[PDB]
Ligand binder design. Structure first.
Ligand SMILES: Nc1ncnc2c1ncn2[C@@H]1O[C@H](COP(=O)(O)OP(=O)(O)O)[C@@H](O)[C@H]1O
Lengths: 418, 82, 418, 82
């Protein structure tokens, strides 16, 4: 059978297949062990087995193909690639490899690759002639990712406000500064739904770090793209691993001239994970943050760019403030001036039970004239002039009232014009 | 005539064969048998080649043209048609 | 008869029982020795003897059926189970096994499990086909646990205000933040009494870590459900060992579509116990707590969830703040954004002898609209709007005054409005 | 008809004998003697079975049908059907 759909079937359905096949006592072990067991039994019949995954090269030299269903968690069912294969095909970590697999031999504990017939959704000899991501020249974003769905629903109101405040383009590097309770999660979900509907071609990845287990489940059911998360009960090295896999996988897709969007929640929790893992260097900043700890989170955030050739990489990360931790404040200080887009959520607007709780005055984008047209930019400047005197709570209440009556931002500008 | 790459396990068998310099016996599609040692694995123009020191001249042959190979240390290996 | 009945049998009663059946000597006061002898005579006569306990598999391969009365402490009377039986029936740590019990063989210190007929309160064949806890998909808590009793007594005020401040649902990962002196133990007792009376079906477990023996004695009397505790004089390894027994026992019950509620006192003490038992990871952060030390407690705390298939596990843990030591506060900072419900206790309200000293403005859950009905949530929002400008100390006085003359919160809402 | 699991101690004795290749003497309900070699214990369809390679036949039979088992090296006891 194909390994990819086995990892998608429910655990209860796997038990029925395993018992039917001939296995027993597989109802009291983890899903990875169940999948490995049924694959082992099927391999004894001599039938070919197809598997796929994302390559992760270890420091020793060999690598494993890990699946996004388990959030790239190491397990018995992971496929093993020999160092020669990584040298035969010019394979880097993050490459998506598909092909046939074989059962482990004596002294082997993992399934091994048998025949590679697809690398990064392309022929193996064509994927090895792609220029590396580091060699691509960054550019300012010039293609607009319009969040406005235009159906006039209440959940579409957040998308319309987002277009007015901070336009988002392909290759943007945005930050969402949020207090502890400002509807941050629903803001990300609204963005993900807008991306899936308006731009089905763009590859969407949602990355969650130190997330509660129940929050992960609802995100996977809602987001149309791919959701990879690490719960807070997992070790700090696990948070780093999943983040490295996502960014490397995104880079490989961009090398094939694809638009990749990464929604990160949160850059603060990612930085704290790196602080734990990175060895101390003796230069500890305020709040107990190592100086070299933040070098790697910035590399993750700094990869967002608009490639001059085909492709783009958009990263929209959330930064946590007012959490009562000195470490969180220090982390946000270093990431303050690094983003093209800034979107500020206001606690007080949320306390008034008004959503989206967006601080319009403090949120904007750099070089926004490239994303929008000429006439639309003039209308946006008119709106910002009106909003500027108003207070943060008053502005959002006023803004939603004028948007509720209209159905599209074009109509909203026309009504506001007269 | 396109080139059909060999399976990963078969390639690994030749890969460590070059490292240990085995005097493996090579059998081709036409039935030509030779006893030589593979120096290394070289791939050019997206086509993989095997270089062996038969007759002391370092002949080069395609991977897919090899039918079988064996050594006294590692049993007979038959490459799949796929 | 069974071993369990002889455990709690009064010393005078068992002497009367022993003399009539034909026990030769009963002058000795050692309870374990005499109950050992009567079982041996029963075995010689062929009389069947039964026993029960909670399995605890050790790293060697075999385990013992510990008893909840002794707080799962290792003892001579613990029933030994061979590793062959562990392989025969799929047994994990925490399973409760009841069945025939064999007297110890010559050279064996402990009794051996003669036969097992009921595991986890179900037939052995059916209990081996239960999906593992890790394979269950978490969900947000939807069905709530009402604790507003209709008695109307003075103790019911603490339950009623807790219902208004922060609802509790099935699978809620609640957290209690308390200063050193805020009447914390009273709050746990009120919840435990409320849970037992309102929800008899839900299994209730109370876990106490580093607790004085006098507190354990009264807690067991008050709480109807099982109470397990470890005294402070015991080594730190005991606190870790008892914690594993409680959580693993809960997980096995949840696999049987059971709702399990765990009250923890406290997560701060449990974190300290794990800190001193784990090997040093080479990197130590502020407060002298190892980075990998906190991984294990998060596994305990993060297990609380609402299983989609059926059943739930509710963990409500207490945390201590501003207790002098900075180790306590860094532990709380690590567990801050990890719980669904957050209930705060204020010292300045406790000093004024106003109980319960909860901070209404700084406590609450995350998704109240799932636990409460549509109408109740609006009333809570209206009440929250009134309380919000008020200070923490005066708000409680406002709450207790208006909750004194109201029998039920529904009547309180009618009184509150207009 | 319905299979009844044997006692744990009876299960252990066969388990320890089969795990270190100990010859076992079979006594069934009918009363026939089957002195042969037992390999291990296999459980299928929630029913425990014992496989005995009597002259290579590798016969498989239910555990509850065994009346008793005897051996000089280990303790000789009779299972209880209750
Ligand atoms: N657009 C919205 N419409 C209605 N309610 C909202 C909206 N955004 C946020 N909320 C409310 O604010 C709360 C914020 O929860 P959530 O966003 O899940 O966590 P966080 O704010 O930490 O990201 C939710 O309980 C939700 O009821």
């Amino acid at each position: 059978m194909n390994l990819t759909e086995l990892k998608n079937t429910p655990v209860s359905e796997l038990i029925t297949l395993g018992e039917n096949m001939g296995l027993e006592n597989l109802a009291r072990m983890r899903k990875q062990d169940i999948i490995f067991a049924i694959l082992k039994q099927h391999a004894k019949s001599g039938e070919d087995i197809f598997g796929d995954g994302v390559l992760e090269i270890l420091q020793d030299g060999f690598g494993f193909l890990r699946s996004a269903d388990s959030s790239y968690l190491a397990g018995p069912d992971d496929i093993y690639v020999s160092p020669s294969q990584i040298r035969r095909f010019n394979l880097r970590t993050g490459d998506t490899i598909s092909g046939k697999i074989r059962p482990p031999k004596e002294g082997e504990r993992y399934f091994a690759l048998l025949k590679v017939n697809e690398v990064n959704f392309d022929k193996p000899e064509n994927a090895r002639n792609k220029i590396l991501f580091e060699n691509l020249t960054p550019l300012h974003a010039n293609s607009r990712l319009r969040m406005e769905r235009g159906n006039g629903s209440t959940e579409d109101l957040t998308a319309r406000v987002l277009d007015l405040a901070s336009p988002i383009g392909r290759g943007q590097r945005g930050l969402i500064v949020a207090p502890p309770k400002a509807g941050k999660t629903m803001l990300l979900q609204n963005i993900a739904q807008s991306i899936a509907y308006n731009h089905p071609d763009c590859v969407l990845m949602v990355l969650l770090i130190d997330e509660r287990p129940e929050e992960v489940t609802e995100m996977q059911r809602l987001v149309k793209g791919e959701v990879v998360a690490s719960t807070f009960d997992e070790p700090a090295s696990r948070h780093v691993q999943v983040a490295e896999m996502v960014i490397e996988k995104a880079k490989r897709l961009v090398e094939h001239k694809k638009d990749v969007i990464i929604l990160l929640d949160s850059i603060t929790r990612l930085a704290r994970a790196y602080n734990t893992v990175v060895p101390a260097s003796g230069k500890v900043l305020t709040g107990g943050v190592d100086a070299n700890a933040l070098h790697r989170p910035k590399r993750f955030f700094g990869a967002a760019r608009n490639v001059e050739e085909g492709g783009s990489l958009t990263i929209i990360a959330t930064a946590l403030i007012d959490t009562g931790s000195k470490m969180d404040e220090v982390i946000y200080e270093e990431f303050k001036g690094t983003g093209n887009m800034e979107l500020h959520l206001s606690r007080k607007i949320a306390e008034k039970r008004v959503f989206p709780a967006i601080d319009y005055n403090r949120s904007g984008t750099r070089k926004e004239e490239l994303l929008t047209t000429q006439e639309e930019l003039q209308k946006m400047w008119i709106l910002r002039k009106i909003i500027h005197p108003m207070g943060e709570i008053d502005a959002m209440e006023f803004l939603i009232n004028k948007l509720a009556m209209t159905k599209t931002n074009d109509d909203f500008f026309e009504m506001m014009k007269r | 005539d396109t080139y059909q790459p060999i399976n990963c396990d078969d390639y690994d068998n030749l890969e460590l064969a070059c490292q240990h310099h085995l005097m493996l016996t090579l059998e081709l599609k036409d039935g030509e048998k030779l006893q030589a040692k593979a120096s290394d694995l070289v791939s050019r123009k997206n086509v993989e080649y095997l270089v062996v020191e038969a007759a002391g001249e370092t002949r080069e042959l395609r991977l897919d043209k090899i039918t079988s190979f064996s050594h006294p240390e590692i049993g007979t290996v038959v490459v799949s048609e796929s």
